[PDB]
C-alpha cells in the first residue's frame, strides 16, 4: 500500500536536478533523521504522484526501498511547482521506535447535516482550518483526527481544546498556549 522505490543520487546541483526533470522523469529527494547521515535519492515522478492521491499520505508510515535495503520514513515536506502544481522535491524523516515526531494530520468533519445550528437556525458550517499539527510516538500516529458538529448551535465556535484526540497524541499548538478556531456556525450570506 504505502511503498516507494528509490535510487541513490550522486550528481547534485541546479544543473543536474534540472536534467532529471527533463530527460529522465525523476524527482530529487533526501532522507534524514534518526541517528544517521542524510542521503540523497531519486524517485520516479509517476510513482510519487500516484501515492499522493491517497488521503492519509502525510500522516502514515511509508516503507522506503533505497536500492535493496528498506527503511521506515515519513513525508516531512514537499516542494511543488507554483504554476503547474507537480512535485519537484521531497524530503523524508526517518522513523525510530522511541522518538517523538511531528506530523500534519487532516481533520474529518462528520454529521454536518444534522447539526443543531444548521437545521434549526439555518446556519452555515465554515471550516476555518482543515488540518492540525501533532507530536506523538510513531506507534500511535493517527491517520485523521475526528471532529463532530452535531451539538453546535448558531454562533458557537469550536476550538482546539474542545476536540478530543487519540490517547498519546499532543496538539502542539494547544501546548504552546494558543488555541485556534476550527469551525463555526454563522448567519447566512443572503
Amino acid at each position: 500500500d504505502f511503498i516507494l522505490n528509490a535510487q541513490v543520487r550522486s550528481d547534485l546541483g541546479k544543473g543536474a536536478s534540472r536534467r532529471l526533470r527533463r530527460n529522465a522523469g525523476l524527482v530529487p529527494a533526501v532522507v534524514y533523521g534518526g541517528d544517521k547521515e542524510p542521503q540523497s535519492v531519486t524517485l520516479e515522478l509517476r510513482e510519487i504522484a500516484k501515492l499522493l492521491e491517497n488521503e492519509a499520505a502525510f500522516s502514515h508510515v511509508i516503507a522506503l526501498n533505497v536500492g535493496g535495503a528498506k527503511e521506515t520514513v515519513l513525508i516531512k515536506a514537499l516542494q511543488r511547482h507554483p504554476a503547474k502544481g507537480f512535485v519537484m522535491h521531497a524530503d523524508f524523516l526517518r522513523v525510530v521506535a522511541d522518538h517523538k515526531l511531528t506530523a500534519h494530520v487532516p481533520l474529518h468533519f462528520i454529521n454536518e447535516e444534522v447539526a443543531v445550528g444548521v437545521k434549526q437556525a439555518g446556519g452555515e458550517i465554515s471550516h476555518t482550518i482543515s488540518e492540525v499539527e501533532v507530536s506523538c510516538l510513531p506507534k500511535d500516529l493517527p491517520e485523521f483526527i475526528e471532529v463532530d458538529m452535531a451539538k453546535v448551535e448558531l454562533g458557537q465556535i469550536v476550538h482546539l481544546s474542545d476536540l478530543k484526540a487519540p490517547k498519546g497524541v499532543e496538539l502542539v499548538q494547544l501546548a504552546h498556549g494558543n488555541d485556534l478556531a476550527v469551525a463555526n456556525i454563522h448567519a447566512s450570506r443572503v
Binding site: 515536506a77 514537499l78 507554483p82 504554476a83 502544481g85 465554515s126 471550516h127 482543515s130 488540518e131 447566512s188
Partner: protein, 137 residues
Amino acid sequence: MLQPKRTKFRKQMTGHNRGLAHRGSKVSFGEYALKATSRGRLTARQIESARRALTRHVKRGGKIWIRVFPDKPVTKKPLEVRMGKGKGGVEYWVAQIQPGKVLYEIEGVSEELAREAFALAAAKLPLATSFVKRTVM
C-alpha cells in the same frame, strides 16, 4: 473600487514583473481557488467585474475571499500633450500578477458549482487561469 486608504507617495516607477509566485500560491482559506498560470496585470475594475460575476452565480451560501489587492498607482498623459513637462497624473490602481498566484477562493459550495462560477469570473480577466483544490502540502 479597491485602492489603499492612503499612501506614503503619490506616484511610482513602472518597474518590472519577473519571477514565479512562490508565496501566495496555496489555497489557504477556502476549498477551491482560481489561480493565475500566466503573468500580467489586473486593473481593479477587472477585479470588480470578476467579483460580481462569481458572486451572482452562487446566490445561496458560500464564503468568498479575494487574495489580490491593487496597490500600484499608474499615471497617464493627457491627449494632445508633448513629451516631458513632468510626470502624468494618477488615473487608476493596479496589481502585479506572477504565474501561480491565487486570485479568488471559495468554500461552502459543491465542486461542480464552484468550477462553473470560476469560469464566469475568468472570462473578465486578461490572463490565463486554472482551477485548483486545497491540499495538505
